[PDB]
Structure formats: C-alpha cells, structure tokens
Design a binder for this molecule. Structure first.
Ligand SMILES: O=C(O)C[C@@](O)(CC(=O)C(=O)O)C(=O)O
Ligand SMILES: O=C(O)C[C@@](O)(CC(=O)C(=O)O)C(=O)O
Ligand SMILES: [Zn+2]
Ligand SMILES: [Zn+2]
Lengths: 334, 338
C-alpha cells in the first residue's frame, strides 16, 4: 500500500515570494524570479526529507494556508497572488513529480463571487494538472460573514468541481480578528462550523458527487459525534451517515494518540484520509513521546486495525476522493 | 453528584411572552409592558415535570442552574433591554432556588450588550451573589452574537469584571447565546467554536499571572480542546509559552457535557482528573435518546459511570472539583454538615 498524505502546504518558501506579497499590499495600501534550485533547496531540506524519514510516498500539496489571506485584498489583489502561489506548487510538482500532486488556492476575496475562482480552478486542473482545491468558507478572515456552504452563492463553483471531478478541502486562512488565533482557534472553529452548516441543509441531495475534506480530523466534530447525531434528530434531519458521510471526509491531522483513537473509533473507515500537515501548524517534538507531534503515521500505525483498514486510510480513501490522482497512478501502473 | 451545567429551559409561558413584547416595544420606541405575575406553583410545575423528574431518574443530587442561554440574546438590543431581561431571568433562577434550595444553586446571566462596558454586569453579579446568594455567573465572550467581534478574554476590557469575580470568589462559565449569524448555528457550531476560541485566547497570553485565582469553566468538555490536546501542547511551544498545566490548568476546568462514551473516554484519558467537572446540560441542546445505546444523549452520568477510574477520581468528577471551583457552594454544603 502507498502512503499518501492528503494535507500539506509549501510552507518554507524562497524569500522573494513573500517579499513580493508585502509590496503588493503596500502598492495596494498606497513579481520575483525564482530558480529551480531555490525551490529544490526549500523542498529537499524540508518536506522531501521528512517524507523519507517518516515512510511516506506522496503528499497532496498546496500553498501555505495562512498566507492566502484573501481579506487583504480585493479581486485585483487576490487573483495574481493566487496565480503565483499555485504556479509555485506546479513547479514543485514539475521538479518532484513522483512525490507531489497539486492542490490550488482560490483567488477569493471578501467582496467577490466565485467567477475568478472558477477560472483558477480550470487553469490549475486543466492546464497545470492539479487534482483538488482549497475552499475558503470565510474570505473575510475571522468573523464568518460569508454565507454558509449550503448557500446558492457557492453553487456555480460546485458545478465546476463536479464537472472537473475534483474535491475541496475546507480551509480558512490567516485571521484579521484579534479575538481569534488562526491555527489554534480559527482553523478548528471553521472545520466545525462548516460541518454544522452542512448538517443544517442538504447540499449533497443537489450535488450527490460533490466531495469535501474538513481538515484537522473534522475540528470538534468526532469528539462531539454524539452531540451531532443528536442534533440531527433535534433538527428533524436525516442521519449523518446518509446526509453527509458519502460526501464529507476528515484527515488525520490530530497530533496525539488519544485523539487519533477516537477518530478511528466513531468515524467510518471510508471517511478517514491520512494527512499530517508537516512543517506547519506544529513543528516541534512532543515532550511526552519523543516523537514529533505531526508525525501522524505513528498514530495510525499504533492502531489495532486490519490491513484492509490501514490501506483505505493510507491510500484507498484518498484515491477515491481524488479521482484525478487515482487515474494518474493507474497510468503509471500503480 | 453535582451537575455543574444546567439551564432553566422549559419555562412558565408568561416569561417567554413578556420577552417578545419587550423586544417589540423596543423596536417601536415604546415603553416595555409590566412583567407578568408568575405563581410559585407555575414554577414548581415546570421544574417538577422536567428537571426534577430527570434528576431523580438519573440519581443526581443537585444542579448549578442558570437562565436559558440561547435566550440571553445580548445582541438584542442595547442596555435598555439587556438589563431588565437579565434581572428578570436571574430572578426566576432565584425563585427556583427558593422553592427547591436543596436541589438547585444559582448561577447568573449578565446584562451584556454589544455597545456597553461591563459596569452593569459587575452590578448584576454583585446583586445576584450578595443579595440573591448565587455562586457564579455565565460570561459571554461575544455578546455580538456570531461574529466574534469583542476583545479576547485577555484584554483589559474584562479586567474590572475579573476583579469583582475575585472579590466574591466566584467562577464564570464562558458561554455564548443565540446566533444572529446565518453561517453559524448556535448549539452545534457557535457554542463549540466559542469554547475552542476562548481556550486559545488564554494560551496566547497569561491572564492568570494577573489573576492567580480567577476561574473559568469551558463547557461542552472544552469544545475541540481535549480532542486536539496534542495540537494545543505543541502550540504552546510554537508560541514559546509555558506548558498548559502551569499556564492554564490550575485556572481552567472542563465540564462532562459530551454526549457519547468515546468522547468521555478521551476526556478522562487526556485531561487531569482535577479539571473535569460533571455536568449534563439536561433538557437543553440534545434532548432525545441515542438510537445506538437506548439511553439519552445527555445522561452523562452513564458515561462517567462506565469509566474504569477509582472511587477518588469519581468523587472529584461528581463532587470534589465543583466544590473547589465554587467555594460558596462548598461553604453552603459544609454548613449543612455535608
Ligand atoms: O503557516 C503555518 O506555519 C501553519 C499552517 O501551515 C497550518 C495549516 O495550514 C493547518 O493547520 O492546516 C498554515 O498555513 O496556517
Ligand atoms: O436553548 C436551548 O434549549 C439549548 C441550551 O440549553 C443549550 C446549552 O446551553 C448548551 O448546550 O450549553 C441553551 O440554553 O442554549
Ligand atoms: Zn492546512
Ligand atoms: Zn449551556
């Protein structure tokens, strides 16, 4: 079985990229040339080394999430940034095509509809060979002032996803809200809110093939699985298994064994996708284990499950959720 | 067996009716109508049919009891509404407490509104604690109702209120109310996000250096926190902050309002025993049976019961921890020779 990591961002970048970013905002408040060897550098010393150390084969790789910051920022700012962030990913893929597959950030901004986003999706899937995207449920950056995912506002975009046969990870970005830390508060809240928004309507009755990944082990959701099943009856809604769990998936970016145990316990096997978000939110060693918080393969490994279960989690669920990756690997005879 | 989280949810019908007339008069710039005469037995009926019925069946002894949280609705509208509403809501709890003083202890809602400082909440805290003998309050981190637009709990906007809490030796349950944000359901999303956000606000600063004996309960088993304990421990280092045990966990406690065994399993596993306070939030967020067990979602005693813990651990969860976090309740119980 292949070990595919479904959650990863290019987090250690050539300086020039981020400096241009700041000057963009400064020329707004009022692009650099990067070499192959610079990118080879940033990736060899970081993700490529850890993949090797940790026994992984592939990582589904997108732009640093907290740097998307669509709230800057109108459509004239977001488009070029989203294009350049995604162009960097396609070069990382180019350079390491057996190791990275591309997921794209969208040029969302607080005031725009999904037109440009539909355009970058097509450019990335159709011309850059990308396999999925990251979808930001709150481009404003901290106050959740966008319409819930059940809103028709988002529909033309899902029509594209469904045309291209590509899933989306629900993923907010950096916070412009002093009351809200990003990787420790905003990210987990959005995971939960996004799940609950879907439990309120019935989106997948309209798009039965639409697939979402809710990162970080679904936020608070599996921990409160009892609460959510119970709210389905409170709201007169269909059960979570029929309403959501053919279309909603959770990664295993939960950085400790007990959390990983609960995830495997209450959530069905087909809904769990191996992911680790390495070199990201939490980079240090765990003082209680001697192993890195984000070396999540270790937690899956220590589970007491069958090969059939381990395989789905490490390879098969992800190839199901990402059809365009499954076909890329089938073509390589894998 | 002391339930640290319960709300007066099934209420005399006149109270609910007044509230609607109150908001209706405010929206039309008119005087609010007189608050209705509610009979002792009107209150008795509601408690006897619901909370008391369930306490007995479940073998609890008492509940720390507060107004219905989703009804607090501080985003409706200004102080001229918030103050009379809160006073009225807390008076009912005080009446419930008078009629069943062996069973319920009072915790108060605050007259928080989006445009006000905490001056009026300090006063109501004083009223209920000094005059009405309540043992705590519910502190709302986002009176704005769904957009998290207030300052974090670390901000000195909250400091004068914190001083009053220390003076009276009372804890606060961090708790939001209804949502005005269509992107955010109250009990399934807002409440949980609120818990998680409150915890990270604390992780970022060091409020308990300034107030060594300030005490917060983060409800619903700590939101996403225990499930993500490793992420939070790691985040402390990413932030070059002290360890959670020292930074937060002598001042922060979680309830057991987790509505399935596996969740209660994780909570006991990862959180120190002294930080866990039995609660159930009965007749509230989730009121039906769990098709997979044949038992009620919120009958949380059943989950603690199934834990392979010692008699001492159980005692702390059901009785000991709560008595430490609410000294006034502790003192009241001692005075009764318990
Ligand atoms: O930027 C970081 O260092 C952290 C991080 O990679 C974290 C992140 O994306 C996640 O927690 O899923 C981010 O982009 O925000
Ligand atoms: O409104 C209700 O009945 C639900 C509820 O009881 C829920 C609640 O308070 C909680 O889950 O903590 C409330 O008061 O908000
Ligand atoms: Zn991420
Ligand atoms: Zn509550």
């Amino acid at each position: 079985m292949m070990i595919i990591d479904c959650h990863g961002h290019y987090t250690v970048l050539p300086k020039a990229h981020d400096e241009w970013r700041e000057q963009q905002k400064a020329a707004f408040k009022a692009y650099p040339e990067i070499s192959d060897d610079e990118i080879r550098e940033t990736i060899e010393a970081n993700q490529l080394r850890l993949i090797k150390e940790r026994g992984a084969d592939m990582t589904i790789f997108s732009p640093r999430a907290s740097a998307m910051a669509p709230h800057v920022g109108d459509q004239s700012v977001a488009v070029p940034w989203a294009q350049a962030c995604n162009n960097l990913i396609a070069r990382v893929v180019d350079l390491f095509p057996e190791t990275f597959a591309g997921v794209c950030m969208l040029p969302q901004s607080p005031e725009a509809d999904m037109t440009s986003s539909i355009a970058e999706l097509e450019r990335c899937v159709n011309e850059l060979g990308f396999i999925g995207c990251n979808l930001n449920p709150d481009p404003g950056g901290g106050h959740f002032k966008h319409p819930p995912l059940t809103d028709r506002f988002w529909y033309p975009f899902y029509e594209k996803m469904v045309e291209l046969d590509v899933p989306a990870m629900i993923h907010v970005s950096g916070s412009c809200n002093p009351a809200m830390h990003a990787t420790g508060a905003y990210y987990l809240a959005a995971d939960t809110i996004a799940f609950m928004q879907l439990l309120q309507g019935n989106l997948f009755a309209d798009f039965p093939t639409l697939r979402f990944i809710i990162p970080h082990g679904g936020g608070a959701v599996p921990y409160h699985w009892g609460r959510f099943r119970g709210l389905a009856d409170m709201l007169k809604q269909p059960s979570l298994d029929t309403l959501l769990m053919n279309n909603v998936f959770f990664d295993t970016c939960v950085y400790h064994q007990p959390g990983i145990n609960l995830l495997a316990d209450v959530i069905d096997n087909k809904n769990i996708l191996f992911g680790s978000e390495m070199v990201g939110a939490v980079r240090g060693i765990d003082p209680t284990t001697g192993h890195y918080f984000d070396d999540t393969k270790r937690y899956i490994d220590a589970l007491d499950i069958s090969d059939q279960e381990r395989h789905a989690i490490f390879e098969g669920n992800t190839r199901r959720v990402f059809p365009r990756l499954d076909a890329k690997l089938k073509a390589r005879g894998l």
